[PDB]
């Protein structure tokens, strides 16, 4: 069902998200989003998610068990919420 | 019609948006989001909007024609965004 929504994205939408994804993984080891980068982003947007909530957000879309979110999984994250 | 979705939003949702709105207008001369505050947010999220794109984004939800976005219009900007 979520695979569908992503596919329903236009080049414009995907590129917008890619630009956001890129700035988010700055200074990130594997070039992916971990709880650290996700926390920083949500806090700069005025939110204060707990370490548990951040891990759940990530585990929910971490299909390859990397413990991090790559762009493809990031798109599913966008889709969900 | 986006007036419908705003109604659908839950408090927690509206509360999260308020927290965002509040951080976005820190420093705004009038507590509202002008092109300056919107541009900073867009850029903070890796985007690059022209001054015109920013004006248009504001205009789409500027019901009182203030040239700025207050919290109620912001909710519509969020809902609208889809
Ligand atoms: C308790 N629980 C805590 C988290 N909230 C949802 C936060 C969603 N969110 C958000 C919403 C309003 C204002 C700022 C933000 S930061 C943010 C960043 C990424 C995502 C992302 F990745 F999902 F798209 C979702 C959010 C729901 C309730
Ligand atoms: C179908 N379409 C799916 C995606 N959603 C938008 C998701 C973006 N998003 C979000 C989602 C739910 C609730 C709040 C938020 S605020 C927010 C803040 C940052 C980002 C981030 F990461 F990009 F920076 C993404 C989001 C719109 C409808
Ligand atoms: C020309 N036109 C300009 C705007 N873009 C959409 C921007 C949506 N958006 C967004 C989407 C993905 C990644 C980052 C961002 S920054 C951002 C900041 C605020 C809003 C906010 F306030 F509206 F919710 C919406 C966005 C579409 C095409
Ligand atoms: C369920 N969903 C809840 C709220 N809105 C979505 C807001 C998410 N949002 C957005 C919307 C459409 C396309 C891209 C994006 S990225 C984005 C980036 C920042 C913000 C920022 F900074 F403003 F918070 C909000 C959004 C639509 C319906
Ligand atoms: Ca992963
Ligand atoms: Ca206004």
UniProtKB/Swiss-Prot annotation, chain B:
One of its GO terms (cellular component) is sarcomere. Ca(2+) 1 binds at residues 62, 64, 66, 68, 73. Changing residue 26 to Q: In CMH13; impairs protein kinase A dependent signaling from cardiac troponin I to troponin C. The keyword Acetylation applies. Residues 13-48, 49-82 form the EF-hand domain. GO terms for biological process: cardiac muscle contraction; diaphragm contraction; muscle filament sliding; regulation of ATP-dependent activity; regulation of muscle contraction; regulation of muscle filament sliding speed; response to metal ion; skeletal muscle contraction. Keywords: Acetylation, Calcium, Cardiomyopathy, Disease variant, Metal-binding, Muscle protein, Phosphoprotein, Repeat. One of its GO terms (molecular function) is calcium-dependent protein binding. Belongs to the troponin C family. It is linked to Cardiomyopathy, dilated, 1Z: A disorder characterized by ventricular dilation and impaired systolic function, resulting in congestive heart failure and arrhythmia. Patients are at risk of premature death. Cardiomyopathy, familial hypertrophic, 13: A hereditary heart disorder characterized by ventricular hypertrophy, which is usually asymmetric and often involves the interventricular septum. The symptoms include dyspnea, syncope, collapse, palpitations, and chest pain. They can be readily provoked by exercise. The disorder has inter- and intrafamilial variability ranging from benign to malignant forms with high risk of cardiac failure and sudden cardiac death. Troponin is the central regulatory protein of striated muscle contraction. Tn consists of three components: Tn-I which is the inhibitor of actomyosin ATPase, Tn-T which contains the binding site for tropomyosin and Tn-C. The binding of calcium to Tn-C abolishes the inhibitory action of Tn on actin filaments. Cardiac muscle Tn-C can bind 3 calcium ions per molecule. Domain I does not bind calcium. This is Troponin C, slow skeletal and cardiac muscles. It comes from Homo sapiens. The lineage of its organism: Eukaryota, Metazoa, Chordata, Craniata, Vertebrata. The gene is TNNC1. The chain holds residues 4 to 85 of 161 of the full protein.
